[PDB]
Design an enzyme around this catalytic site. Sequence first.
Site, short mmCIF file in Angstrom:
data_model
loop_
_atom_site.label_atom_id
_atom_site.label_comp_id
_atom_site.label_asym_id
_atom_site.label_seq_id
_atom_site.Cartn_x
_atom_site.Cartn_y
_atom_site.Cartn_z
N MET A 25 0.84 -1.14 0.00
CA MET A 25 0.00 0.00 0.00
C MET A 25 0.91 1.24 0.00
O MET A 25 1.95 1.21 0.66
CB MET A 25 -0.80 -0.10 1.29
CG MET A 25 -2.04 0.64 1.30
SD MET A 25 -2.90 0.13 2.77
CE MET A 25 -1.58 0.17 3.99
N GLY A 26 0.56 2.29 -0.75
CA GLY A 26 1.39 3.54 -0.83
C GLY A 26 0.86 4.72 0.01
O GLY A 26 0.12 5.58 -0.52
N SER A 27 1.26 4.82 1.30
CA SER A 27 0.92 5.99 2.22
C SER A 27 2.17 6.53 2.94
O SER A 27 2.57 5.99 3.98
CB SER A 27 -0.16 5.61 3.22
N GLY A 28 2.71 7.65 2.43
CA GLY A 28 4.06 8.16 2.81
C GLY A 28 4.93 8.43 1.58
O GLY A 28 4.62 9.30 0.75
N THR A 29 6.06 7.70 1.47
CA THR A 29 6.91 7.64 0.25
C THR A 29 7.69 6.31 0.20
O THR A 29 7.30 5.39 -0.54
CB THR A 29 7.81 8.89 0.14
N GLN A 32 8.35 0.06 3.76
CA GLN A 32 7.37 -1.00 3.36
C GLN A 32 6.16 -0.92 4.30
O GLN A 32 6.35 -1.01 5.53
CB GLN A 32 7.95 -2.41 3.46
CG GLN A 32 8.37 -3.02 2.13
CD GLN A 32 8.73 -4.48 2.25
OE1 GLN A 32 8.93 -5.00 3.37
NE2 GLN A 32 8.77 -5.16 1.10
N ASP A 142 6.48 19.99 6.65
CA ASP A 142 6.18 19.45 5.31
C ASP A 142 4.66 19.22 5.15
O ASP A 142 4.20 18.10 5.01
CB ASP A 142 6.98 18.16 5.12
CG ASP A 142 7.12 17.68 3.69
OD1 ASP A 142 7.13 18.53 2.75
OD2 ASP A 142 7.22 16.45 3.52
#
Length: 280
Positions: A25-29, A32, A142
Amino acid sequence: QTGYLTIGGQRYQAEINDLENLGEMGSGTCGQVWKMRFRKTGHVIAVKQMRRSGNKEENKRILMDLDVVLKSHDCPYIVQCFGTFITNTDVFIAMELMGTCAEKLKKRMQGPIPERILGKMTVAIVKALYYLKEKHGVIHRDVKPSNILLDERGQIKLCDFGISGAAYMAPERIDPPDIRADVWSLGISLVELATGQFPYKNCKTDFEVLTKVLQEEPPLLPGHMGFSGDFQSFVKDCLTKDHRKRPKYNKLLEHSFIKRYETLEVDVASWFKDVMAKTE
């Protein structure tokens, strides 16, 4: 703090084999981040895996961020940690699973996100950033749509990634003669999401963006999209070029935009479901 998951208020002993891996799953950059199912209850959670043999500075970052997250258990606008598992080779950090970040929402929508959603978002994010500052002396440094998370239940929370503090950078951050540089960044994020267009999308390099921030007039919300005076004012206030005149969070929390959305009922949940349905 380790060997338990605490969800809802129910506490459960647990090891990593009590979770079924449902895929990445892609949450952040970087890192893993798995979507995992807790077998004992059927809860679905996010799990960050930090490998002992991993990159020293990715690891350092992960640990500073967790540190802040663990201290922020009483902030409703920050993603919560449910627990951790430590093995000889890994740390697994169990986090609140959110639906998506506002950058992907924007990509799904292929247009503007409505003011009423952006109002609830603004309330939540300004409260998270203020909490961080006041309680933990953290400047987030950020603020951007990828750090703003939403879920099926209408919750909005600041993401754990870099929570321990190019294109969202304040003029005084670019060229200092303050939590107020985060405020600029919030401003830019609200214009981007409200319009569906990043205000410097025609820059080819980071430095060109910088030059636009310093040389040009602040981007303001357009006047012909039916935004309230409140939202227009709020954004104008956030995008004050002179940082010495730009409001702090304390001031921003009194702004009529924030007061309106503290109060007003907005069904973020249904809107969110509709978007996630109607889209790939």
